[PDB]
Amino acid sequence: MPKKRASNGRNKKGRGHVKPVRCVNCSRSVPKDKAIKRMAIRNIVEAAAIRDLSEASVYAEYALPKTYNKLHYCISCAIHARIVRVRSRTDRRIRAPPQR
Amino acid sequence: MVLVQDLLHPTAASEARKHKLKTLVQSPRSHFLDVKCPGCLNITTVFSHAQTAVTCESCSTVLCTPTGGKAKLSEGTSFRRK
Amino acid sequence: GRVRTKTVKRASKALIEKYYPKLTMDFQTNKRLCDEIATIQSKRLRNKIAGYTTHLMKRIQKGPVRGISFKLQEEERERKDQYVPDVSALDLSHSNDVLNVDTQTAELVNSLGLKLPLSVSSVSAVRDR
Amino acid sequence: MENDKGQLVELYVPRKCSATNRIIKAKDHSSVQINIAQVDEEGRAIPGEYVTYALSGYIRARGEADDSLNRLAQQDGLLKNVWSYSR
Amino acid sequence: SLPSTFDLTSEDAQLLLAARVHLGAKNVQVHQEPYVYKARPDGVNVINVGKTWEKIVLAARIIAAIPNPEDVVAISSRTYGQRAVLKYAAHTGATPIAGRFTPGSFTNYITRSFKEPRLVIVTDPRSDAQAIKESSYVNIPVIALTDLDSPSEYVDVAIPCNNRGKHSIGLIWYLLAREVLRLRGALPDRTQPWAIMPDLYFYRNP
Amino acid sequence: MGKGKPRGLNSARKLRVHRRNNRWAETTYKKRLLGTAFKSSPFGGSSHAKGIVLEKIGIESKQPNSAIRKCVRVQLIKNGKKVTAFVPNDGCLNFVD
Amino acid sequence: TRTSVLADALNAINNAEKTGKRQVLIRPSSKVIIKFLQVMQKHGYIGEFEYIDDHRSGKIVVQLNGRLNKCGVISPRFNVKIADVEKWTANLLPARQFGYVILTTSAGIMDHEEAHRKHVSGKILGFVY
Amino acid sequence: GWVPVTKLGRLVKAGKISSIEEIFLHSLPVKEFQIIDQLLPNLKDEVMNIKPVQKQTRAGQRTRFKAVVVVGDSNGHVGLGIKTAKEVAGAIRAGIIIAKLSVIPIRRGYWGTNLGQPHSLATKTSGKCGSVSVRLIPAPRGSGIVASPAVKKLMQLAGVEDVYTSSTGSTRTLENTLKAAFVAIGNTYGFLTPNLWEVQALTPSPMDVYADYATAS
RNA sequence: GAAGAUGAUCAGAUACCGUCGUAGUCUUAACCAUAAACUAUGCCGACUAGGGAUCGGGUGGUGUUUUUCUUAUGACCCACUCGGCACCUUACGAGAAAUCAAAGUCUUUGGGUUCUGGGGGGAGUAUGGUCGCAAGGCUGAAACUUAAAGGAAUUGACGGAA
Ligand SMILES: [Mg+2]
Ligand SMILES: [Mg+2]
Ligand SMILES: [Mg+2]
Ligand SMILES: [Mg+2]
Ligand SMILES: [Mg+2]
Ligand SMILES: [Mg+2]
Ligand SMILES: [Mg+2]
Ligand SMILES: [Mg+2]
Ligand SMILES: [Mg+2]
Ligand SMILES: [Zn+2]
Ligand SMILES: [Zn+2]
C-alpha cells in the first residue's frame, strides 16, 4: 500500500511523538495533529429563541454571549458526519479553508 | 545567474549580499572602529565585534558592550572607522 | 422539453451564414426561403429549422452572437473598429502638463535620452497591503 | 565519417545549437531556427539575408533560452545595452 | 552589425512611460529577468526601457526575416490585448488568434483552425501558455510580451512590458507593428508619428 | 551515495568476507557446501539408485487434471530409505509387478 | 569529509555540462585537478580556465565549450599494468577510435594514448567521452 | 489519391525536398505519412508481435490488438510503430503508418579503422523504456548482430550489419524493449564526437526558402 | 478500564453496544530492550530550478510607531544573509508507477563509509549458544513443500463510503 499523503497526521514532522487528545464523540485517543479541530462558536441562545429571551428580559443590548468549544474528533468519527468530506486524489492536495 | 555568468568579476553588490565566506575570496566585513571616549583625549582602536567589556587604555570608562554581533557603543560615544 | 435538436441548430447556423439577407424576422416567409434553399426531406423538420432561423434573426436584432459572425456582421464590426468613436486630441498626449513620472523613471530617461518633459513625483512607497 | 580518403560518409550532418553546441536531433521537436534579418542604414532590413541562429530544445524547455539568444545577438552585434557579461 | 541609428526616440520613451510599460511587475519577480532598473520600494519593480526597445526591434527584425507574411500567427486570450493583436494583424497580413486558441491548432492537421506558422507571437505566456506548449510540439519560434512574473519557457525574444495591462500591452503591440513596418514596408523613416495612431489598439468600452 | 560496499584500494579482504557471507543466501551454493544431498535426499547425491518394489500404489493427482498416477513404493538398496516412484507410459505398472 | 577533491570537481563540471552552463566554479583546486584540466584543453574539451588565489587552498573557474559529454573519475586509483589499460578503455570509453582515460604515472598526468606512446602507465584518475 | 495538408507535404509533392536527410537536418515534423514513402521506396515493414489486450466491462471485455511494427531498409533509417485497434489488419496498417511517420536516421560508424563502408554503430549508445535498458556496443566486422531476436531484426532493418547488445531489465516486455532499442539508435545522432567539433554554417530550411510553393493558394 | 460479572440482540454471540470494574493506567525503586521506535527514506560529502513564506541568528535601511522633548531599548515593515520540524511546473535528471528537487548527477555504470536482502512458505520456528526474575530478547537451521508470493497501477464489479 502506497502513501495516501506526505503529511498523514500532519503537524508531527520533526516532532518525534507528540502528546495526544481525546475525541469529543468517541473518546478515542487521537494525536493532537491527526485531530480535526473544528471550533464551535455558537451563541448561547437558539436563533428563534433569542427573540423570546429579549421579550422576557431586563436591561438593553444585553450580553447575549457565545459558548466556545474547540472540538477534537477521532478522524473516523469526523468522517461519520463532521468536516471531513472524502475527496478525489487531486483534490486532497488543497489545504485552503473551505467555503468563504 | 543563468548559463553565462562570467564568474571572475561579479558586481560588488552581489558580493556584499553574499556570506562573508561565500564570495570569490574570503574577506571579512568587521572593522576597527577607532573610538574616542568622552573623558581622556586618546583613541582606542576598537574592533567592532568586541566580545569584551571594552575599557579604555587605563581609565574604567566602558566604551562598548559586546552584543552578539556588532558592539553597542555605550552611551554618547564618538568613533572613527577602521 | 422543447430543446431544438443539434442538427437543426447546425442547419439554421449554416442558413444564417449563407443568406443573412433574405431572412426577414417573420416566420412563414423564412420557412418558404428555407424550402427554396436547402433539401429538407421532412416538413416538420423544415418548420423547426425555419423557427430556429427566426429566433437567430431576433437575437441578432438585439446584437451579435457566438458562432454567428458571417460576412455582414464582420463588416459591421470592422467599420466600427476602423472609425472608432475615439480619438479626439492624439490621444495619450501630454495633455495635462508634462508627464507625472517617478524618480526612477526620470533617472532611466536621463540615462537613455537627453531632454524630455518630466514632472518628478515624490514616490510614496506607502504602508500596508 | 570520412572513409578511406575523404569520401564523407554519414549524411544528415546535424545542426548544432548556437547557445549550447549540443547537437539538434532529427526529431528534436522543440528546437528552432531563428532568422534575424540583416540591418542596413535608415530603415531597410535587406531582403534574403539573415543571421540565422539554432536553439536546442533543452534550453527552450529550461527557459534559459531567451537569455542565451540575447547573449548571442550581443556577441554578433545585433544589440547594445541588453545582455551584460556579469550579472 | 548594427546601424547605430535606432537608439530609442525620446517621444517613444515618453509614450512608454505614460503607458506604464515599466511600472509593472510588482513584488513578484523571476530569476531569468535582468530587465529591471532599480526597485521602487514596497510592491514595485521598475523596468529598463532601452533594453525593452532593443528586444522589440529584434523581434521586428525576426518577423521581417520570415518571407511569406501570412504566417506570423499573433495570439491573445486575455481580453485587454485581443483588440491590439487584431489591429496588428490587420496592419501586417498575418492570420491572428483573438480569444480562444484552440488546442491542436499547430498540431492536428484536421482542425478547422489548423494554422501552420513559422513565427508565433504572444501577449501573456502565463495565460496563452497553452499556445506556447503547442508551438513547442512542432518547431516554431515564439515572441512574447513578458511581465517580470511571466514564465519564459519555450519563449524567445521576450519583449519586457507591464502585464497589469490596460494601456500597456496594446502600446507595446503598436510599437512592434511600427517596427515591423519600418523593417521592409511603407514607412521608410524612424521619425514622423505618421497617419496611424496608438489608440487604434487598446481595450475598448464594453 | 557511495553505495554500500567499500570502494577503497585496500578494502579487499572485507569485500571478500561480505561476498562469502552473502553466498549463504544462495540456495544451490548452500546445498553444495553443507552436503544436503549427501546427508539427505534419498539418493546419495547420485543420478540413480536401485530399489526394491515394496508395493504398487495409485496416487491421486494434485488439481486441474484429476487422475490416479500409478506410482510404486520403492525401498532404496544402498541407504535403506523408502520413496515413491511414478511409473511412465500406458500400463507400465503391470510390467513392473 | 571532502574526499577526492578532484572527483568532486569533475562531478561539478559534469553537472554544469548537463545544465548547459558555459562555465564552472570549483572550490578546492588541486595540482591533479589542474593537470586534468590541462589535458582536457590539449585534447579539445575545455576553453580557458583560471586559478584564483584564495590566499589559502585554491579556487578554479573553467570555461565549458559544450563539447564535454562526461568527465568521469574512477574511484580508487587502480594500479594499471599496461595490458589492462586496453581493458579499462573498453570498459569506460565509447569506441576504439576516440576519447581518453586520464591516468597518472611516473612521467606525469597524461591520457592513455600518451602513456602508450611513452611506454609508461600507472594509476588511473578519470576519462573524457 | 494524394493531396497534402502540411506545408512540408506540399513541398514534397512539388519535388523540391529531395531526400529525408534534409528533413532530418531541419528536424521538420512529418504528421503526414505519404511523404516518407515518396522519399524512401525501400521500406521493409515487419510486424514484431501482436498482444491481444482487454479492457474489462460490465459484461465481458474489449479485445483489441497492440500490433508492434518495425520499418526499415538498409540505408540507416528505422521506424517503430505501435497501435492497438480491434480489426487486426487495420491495427497493423496503423502501426506501419506510425513507424513511417517516426522514421529516424542512424549514425553508422567504424568498429575500428575506416577501410570499407560503415555498418556498425559509432559509439556505445543506450536507451531506456520502463525497465528495459538496451545498450548497443559497436562490434567488429563480420561478427554479426548479437541481440535478442526482435532487437536483431530491428538492427537488420536499420542496416547495422554488426553490433553487440546488452538488453537488461525485463526484455520480454517486447514492445518496451523495441522502444528502448529505438531510443538508443536515436541517441547515436546526438552523441557528440570530435568529428563534429568543427562548426557548420546553419543552412536555410526548405520551409523558409520554398515558402511560396508551400502553403495553399 | 484486558480480567470478570452482566443486559439486550441474533439460528447462536462468554462479541461489539450496554451497565459495572481486580491489574494496572499515574506515580516511586528495579528490570526488560522490544514497536507500523515509520520519513516503512543509513550516515558524511559535493554539485545541479524557480518560489514564497515560516522558526533562530545577524546586517542595512533620515522607514513607522512607541514618547519622557533628540530619544535609546522594544516591535514591526522591507531587502539580503546564513539556519531546521514545509508548495508549482517541466523534467532534460529518476523512477515499475504512485511519485521524487531527491528517491537526481547510474549500461555516458567508480565521491567516502556502515549495515541489510537474494522466489514464496516451512520460520523468527527446531536446535544449540547467550541474555534475562519471568514474559521474552538477541542469535538462528534444515528437511519438506510450492508456481506463483508480491508490488504498483488500469478498467471493471462491488461497498450497511460521500
Ligand atoms: Mg488502502
Ligand atoms: Mg507489506
Ligand atoms: Mg530536529
Ligand atoms: Mg518517533
Ligand atoms: Mg480440473
Ligand atoms: Mg467495558
Ligand atoms: Mg449476556
Ligand atoms: Mg526463502
Ligand atoms: Mg495492489
Ligand atoms: Zn471520535
Ligand atoms: Zn584613560
Residue numbers in the entry:
A (entry chain a): 1 to 100
B (entry chain b): 1 to 82
C (entry chain R), G (entry chain W): 2 to 130
D (entry chain V): 1 to 87
E (entry chain A): 2 to 207
F (entry chain X): 1 to 97
H (entry chain C): 39 to 255
Paper's wording?
Type IV IRESs form a homogenous class of viral RNAs, which completely dispense with the requirement for any IFs and thus are able to directly recruit and assemble a translating 80S ribosome by themselves. The approximately 190 nucleotide sequence folds into a compact, well-defined three-dimensional structure making use of three internal pseudoknots (PKI-III). As a result, two stem loops (SL-IV and SL-V) are exposed and are responsible for the bulk of interactions with the small ribosomal subunit. PKI is an independent domain of the type IV IRESs that mimics a tRNA anticodon stem-loop interacting with a codon.
To gain insights into the interactions that make this possible, we assembled binary CrPV-IRES/40S complexes for analysis by cryo-EM. A final subset of 54,561 particles produced a homogenous map with an overall resolution of 3.8 Å; however, as previously noted, many CrPV-IRES elements have a lower local resolution because they are more dynamic. Careful analysis of the local resolution also showed a high degree of flexibility in regions of the IRES not directly involved in interactions with the 40S, such as L1.1 and L1.2. Interestingly, the CrPV-IRES appears to have restricted the conformational flexibility of the 40S head. This is mainly accomplished by insertion of SL-IV and V of the IRES in the cleft formed between the head and the body of the 40S, as previously seen in the context of the pre-translocation binary complex CrPV-IRES/80S. With this conformation of the head, PKI is able to bind well to the decoding center, allowing for a detailed analysis of its contacts. Briefly, the conserved adenines 1753 and 1754 (1492 and 1493 in E. coli) project outwards from helix 44 (h44) to interact through A-minor motifs with the nucleotides forming base pairs (BP) 1 and 2 of the codon/anticodon minihelix. Accessory elements from other ribosomal components including G576 (G530 in E. coli), C564 (C518 in E. coli) and residues from uS12 (P64 and S66, [P48 and S50 in E. coli]) assist in monitoring the shape of BP1 and BP2, and less stringently of BP3 (the wobble position). We also observed an additional base pair between position 1 of the first translated codon and the ribosomal base C1273 (C1054 in E. coli; termed BP4, Figure 1B,D and E). In standard decoding, this ribosomal base interacts with the anticodon nucleotide of BP3, whereas here a rotation of the base about its glycosidic bond allows for a tight stacking interaction with one of the CrPV-IRES bases, redirecting C1273 towards the first base of the first coding codon of the CrPV RNA. However, in the context of the 40S subunit, partial density for the VRL can be observed.
